[PDB]
Amino acid sequence: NQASVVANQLIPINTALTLVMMRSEVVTPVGIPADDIPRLVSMQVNRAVPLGTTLMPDMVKGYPP
């Protein structure tokens, strides 16, 4: 029942995250926790993230839990 951040649209490379890009969903494997969505705003991804992909810690520049 742990929810993760999932891409609500394709997120292009080297693009700053906004709220409309991030939804929460119970997926496996588990990625960045959904509660970290506010922290992620304005952070950039280091690769394109397709629609429906779980955001993982290694995808986000500067992310540490």
Side-chain angles (χ1 to χ4, degrees), residues 33-64:
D35 61 63
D36 292 353
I37 284 172
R39 299 186 58 213
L40 291 169
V41 172
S42 306
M43 302 188 73
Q44 296 183 1
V45 294
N46 61 23
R47 67 193 74 173
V49 180
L51 175 64
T53 302
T54 304
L55 278 64
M56 297 286 168
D58 60 328
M59 298 176 177
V60 182
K61 298 189 198 176
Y63 179 85

Side-chain angles (χ1 to χ4, degrees), residues 3-34:
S4 301
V5 183
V6 171
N8 190 54
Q9 57 165 80
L10 186 144
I11 307 170
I13 193 170
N14 286 335
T15 297
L17 291 163
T18 67
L19 289 171
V20 293
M21 298 175 177
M22 297 182 277
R23 67 182 188 230
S24 173
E25 195 180 343
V26 181
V27 290
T28 62
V30 173
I32 295 173

